[PDB]
Design a protein around this nucleic acid. Structure first.
Lengths: 193, 246, 178
DNA sequence: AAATGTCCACGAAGGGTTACTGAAAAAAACATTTATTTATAGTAGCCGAAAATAGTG
DNA sequence: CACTATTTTCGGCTACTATAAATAAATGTTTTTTTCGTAACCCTTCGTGGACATTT
């Protein structure tokens, strides 16, 4: 319809709004719209907030690509809780029959942390040591119900420990956006396994 | 100071609200103070928001209002009092939400949030117009809708006047007043406009500039004989149509 | 911030051009000026999962408030409506969270609160009136009399309204005949 | 009878003109919030005490 | 060397965060209709002469 065309011309400004902001490249916005388009027809957009469904729709497209983007970088712009936008994500995936899905692999997040962290120009040895620490962390038994951004926020602390004094538990928390004392618990955990 | 203001608004309360006041009578009414001090207490009384500035055409004019509705609007903050002042200045005919947005510079959210708070305080009602429908006109609770009725059941009374004449214009009024007629206002100006309808249907005739006869369409009611001509219309090819030459 | 006028010797009782309209920003400007001026360091606005969410930290309970609680839980059955005002700036939610808390840690005192169904050690007669001394008035019928005043004021309004309805009917008939 | 005024028509003269290298409201539909309540584990603020070792005279 | 003292840490307190049910009512939130450049050349105008009628 004309009203159905007008409700997606507006809804095309929304997906291009957040993708300009989080540096989402242009082959995901166009991939995200069909997920919005099938959820449009199946009575999922009625009632809920317009700006609350399109970020949950975009995260489906960002998970399928296996890219470094978390879920809370959507919500912190929107100034709501993580659990508000996360709850309407769960009622999207099981309702609309999304069976296959990538896992939140924490080894993706190490390589993207360093560049805006502004560490030393030998930025490969902080990474080559870290994924080998994450491979060491993988076989070892700590992260199974815990957080993907949590356990990947204490490895790069410990990988950069032995070479730099970048560990002050605040510049890495300003990167990982996970609390200060919940990664010291991780450092107490792996020391004693 | 304040005691002379108690004498000033007594003169505003002395006359019934009409016959609006001005200074050249009020200086002759009150001239105990010189004009260097007369103006100062009135500007102080503008700051006590009880006197207003009315306009009679092209020249200077005043009007004093009741105090009991002055504290009514002093409950509001200055923006709610700003929309309230225009909406009583119309009063007798109402105001349109676009016109109430233009004269104040308040944009679309800050005026729509303003009167919504004002309606809960029982200070604005919402009526729809008939001279221009589908437009939101607001008034006070004075209930002055100066703007018969546009919805149907007009012709439910025109069958009554036509049964009245078929047996054979001032007399037409008093037949309608009886017989449990659901009416509220009759006048000869209306009934002539009520009579011109059946002039156009030729159900009655106009003779001698006020008299009315039946055109004998009762015998058609019961070649010019347009019922009892039923068509064939079925499996018939050579039938005559009014369109299909254009 | 009303309309102002002036006394000009040339034009007496003249109205001024500027106060005709209001700015609506100068009164906002002075409000802003006595505000704190902070220099933002990008590490201050740090956000985590515990951000933009419900809730706070309840003050840990005291033994002073225990004897104001269990006696309220011995007299009444479990009535959170009036306990909420007894604790003046505590809320309805966390006293219910305290109720489930005291089941688990002290499971025997909620039995003693249930078992005692009688007048206790009769010291609560002051505590009966310690609640009843705030704004002493017969609320069983003082709530009635001002509500009677509320409908009395409304009974003025229709009289002021319906007499304003009939003044419309006399004027709109007068210009019809004119 | 004639002479002047008046009514009318037609050509004369310049005038300009045209293709050339949407938002607003209303009935409609519907998720959210509120109220439990019952287990689990992590996230986290938060104190808070309290262990403890860094450190002042 | 004695203890003061911020630091380090344990620790528990608390408070939801999903997941399924009963309503039920209030609340907001978002779609689908219903309506308010030169050169002909037509064009336009100023104008001048013909005849008709009244009047001298």
């Amino acid at each position: 319809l004309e009203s159905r065309e007008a409700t997606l011309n507006n809804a095309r400004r929304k997906l291009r709004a957040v993708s300009y902001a989080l540096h989402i490249p242009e082959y995901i916005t166009d991939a995200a719209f069909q997920w919005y388009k099938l959820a449009l027809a199946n009575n999922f957009v009625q009632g809920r907030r317009s700006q609350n469904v399109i970020a949950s729709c975009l995260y489906v497209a960002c998970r399928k690509e296996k890219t470094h983007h978390m879920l809370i970088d959507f919500s912190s712009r929107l100034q709501v809780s993580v659990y508000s936008i996360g709850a309407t994500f769960l009622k999207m995936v099981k309702k609309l029959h999304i069976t296959e899905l990538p896992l939140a692999d924490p080894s993706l997040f190490i390589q993207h942390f360093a560049e805006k962290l502004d560490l030393a120009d030998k930025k490969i040895k902080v990474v080559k040591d870290a994924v080998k620490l994450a491979q060491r962390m993988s076989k070892d038994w700590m992260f199974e119900g815990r957080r993907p951004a949590g356990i990947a926020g204490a490895c790069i602390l410990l990988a950069c420990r032995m070479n730099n004094l970048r560990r002050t538990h605040t510049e890495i928390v300003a990167v990982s956006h996970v609390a200060e004392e919940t990664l010291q618990q991780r450092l107490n955990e792996f020391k004693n396994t | 100071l304040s005691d002379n203001a108690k004498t000033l608004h007594s003169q505003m309360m002395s006359k019934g609200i009409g016959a609006l006041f001005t200074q050249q009578e009020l200086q002759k009414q009150m001239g105990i103070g010189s004009l260097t001090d007369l103006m100062s207490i009135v500007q102080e009384l503008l700051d006590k928001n009880l006197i207003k500035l009315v306009k009679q055409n092209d020249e200077l004019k005043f009007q004093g209002v009741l105090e009991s509705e002055a504290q009514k609007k002093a409950t509001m903050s200055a923006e709610e009092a700003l929309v309230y002042s225009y909406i009583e200045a119309s009063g007798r005919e109402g105001i349109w939400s676009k016109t109430i947005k233009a004269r104040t510079n308040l944009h679309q959210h800050v005026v729509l949030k303003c009167l919504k708070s004002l309606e809960s305080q029982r200070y604005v009602k919402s009526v729809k117009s008939v001279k221009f429908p589908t437009r939101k006109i607001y008034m006070l609770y004075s209930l002055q809708p100066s703007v018969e009725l546009d919805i149907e059941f007009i012709n439910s009374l025109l069958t009554i006047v036509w049964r009245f004449i078929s047996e054979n214009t001032q007399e037409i009024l008093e037949f309608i007043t009886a017989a449990q007629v659901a009416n509220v206002e009759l006048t000869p100006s209306n009934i002539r406009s009520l009579c011109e309808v059946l002039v156009y249907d030729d159900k009655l005739e106009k003779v001698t500039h006020d008299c009315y006869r039946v055109t004998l369409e009762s015998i058609l009611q019961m070649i010019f004989n347009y019922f009892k001509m039923f068509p064939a219309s079925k499996h018939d090819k050579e039938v005559v149509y009014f369109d299909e030459w254009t | 911030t009303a309309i102002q006028l002036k006394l000009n010797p040339d034009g007496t009782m003249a109205i001024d051009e500027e106060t005709m309209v209001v700015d609506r920003h100068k009164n906002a400007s002075i409000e802003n000026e006595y505000k704190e001026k902070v220099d933002e360091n990008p590490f201050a606005n740090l956000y985590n999962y515990g951000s933009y969410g419900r809730g706070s930290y309840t003050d840990p309970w005291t033994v002073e408030e225990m004897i104001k609680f269990y006696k309220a839980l011995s007299m009444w059955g479990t009535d959170f409506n009036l306990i909420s005002q007894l604790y003046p700036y505590r809320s309805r939610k966390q006293v219910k969270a305290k109720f489930v808390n005291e089941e688990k840690k002290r499971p025997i005192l909620i039995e003693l609160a249930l078992r005692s169904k009688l007048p206790p050690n009769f010291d609560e007669y002051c505590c009966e009136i310690k609640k009843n001394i705030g704004t002493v008035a017969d609320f069983n019928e003082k709530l009635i009399e001002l509500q009677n005043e509320h409908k009395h004021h409304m009974k003025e309004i229709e009289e002021a309204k319906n007499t304003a309805k009939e003044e419309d009917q006399t004027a709109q008939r007068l210009n019809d005949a004119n």
